[model samples]
Target: SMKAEEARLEGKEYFTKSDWPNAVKAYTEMIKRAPEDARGYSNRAAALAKLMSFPEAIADCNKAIEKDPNFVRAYIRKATAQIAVKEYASALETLDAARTKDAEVNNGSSAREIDQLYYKASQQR
Candidate 1:
């Protein structure tokens, strides 16, 4: 019954020594309950980024976005990672998507967060 915590915990065993490959391997399993929120996929993506796995990170972010269309944080993480790979247009597009999410999700402050990164992407371009 504690598998939710257990599900997430196994990955920590690997990351304790900061071994992200195994960390994400432990995290590879999708959340069985299937709410599609950002936490699980995003958590996995965090590990993926450490592995320099950008495509996988973007995929996980897309999954999270599908799970919750107004997930600003998910967009933030995804866009930023995309930028790390110099995906300037993609990052700006994604950051714009984050901005477009329901304001209720962001409490209106996501604009600034999104804007700053938007510029970051543009400047990087």
Candidate 2:
């Protein structure tokens, strides 16, 4: 219930401090409390990436995407994780999906950010 939001808030504070492990721990709690919340998975993905756990981050992002396919943040985080693992082609595909999603909902609000990741991935491919 309300505890899920508290857990997420704790996770955010830890993340802001670059305390990756605590952030993940808190987000893990948030997930347990609110398994259907895409934001929790996405938050955990970011924390896992900070810990250099790219595969785990990708898995979290997948869960987030499954919970909310229109969440551009999840796609972007997944692409970032893919790129970290040298899966540049996979990152490109992810970014493409994010771009399509953004057009439909975000109204290109995040286009520049998407373009930046696309360039990074494309260059590596």
Candidate 3:
């Protein structure tokens, strides 16, 4: 749909502008229009994270993962948000899952980053 596409574009624009609330609104609209689109959920998760809505951000990431199991960004966002919320154990688990998935998909850089982030988050806790 044209409206959905426009919403997505607006979301990207807002993200680029660092206007997280507007980005969230746009991405949420996109999600409403295309519930199965993992990108929409992932983008919304990012905005939610930036807004410090950690739990909701993680939930959006979970939705993204459910929509697309191979969605690496979803796992990354979830782990990051979990870390922000001080859910260290959950963050570590999420990152570990991301690493395993990346390894299975031959995404070397993604796997490495997950490892790095996991280590950093662990140390912070």
Candidate 4:
């Protein structure tokens, strides 16, 4: 457990320093140690997204969702990863799901921003 915690802390440290590869490595180790922990996979997915590994990041987000369906951060990260891959429709759908789950949650912005992102992605066709 201590190793897992250490890995998570190292991941956070690397992430804070913008060392995405190391962050991914540490977060991956943490996930290996605690596969059910949504935060680890979510963080790893974010690092992967930063590395332009969009598909892998989406996969990690899928795992995170499987572990915790109500993981709002996972949904946001997944949608953003999809956007990185230019899977605009997918990102829009993912954000729609997030919106449906809790419209008032304010994932980190005003509802207008969320709606704007959704509309932008949706109209990307």
In model 1, the runs with Cα more than 4 Å from the true position are 10-17, 30-37, 109-112
Which of candidates 3 and 4 reaches a greater TM-score?
A: 3
The list of candidate 4 runs beyond 4 A from truth reads 104-113
- What's the candidate order when arranged by decreasing TM-score? 2, 3, 4, 1
Please provide, for model 1 over 6-111, each residue's C-alpha lDDT reduced to its tens digit, 9 standing for 90 to 100.
Answer: 7678777776778998878766653553345456677787789888899998888888788777667788889989998998999988877788773767667778
Higher-ranked by TM-score: 1 or 3: 3
In model 3, which regions exceed 4 Å deviation? Answer: none
- For model 2, how does the per-residue alpha-carbon lDDT over 2-70 read when each residue is reduced to its tens digit? 999999999999999999999999999999999999999999999999999998999999999999989
With a 3 Å backbone cut-off (N, CA, C), the pairs that clash in candidate 3 are none
Candidate 4 residue lDDT tens string, 14-121: 999999999999998999998788989999998998898988999999999999887777887787778777899789889887776545454545456557668777
The C-alpha RMSD in Å for every predicted model, in order, reads 2.8, 0.7, 1.4, 2.2
Clashing residue pairs in candidate 4 are none
Say which prediction, candidate 1 or candidate 2, comes out ahead on lDDT: 2
Which residues of candidate 2, in runs, are more than 4 Å off?
none
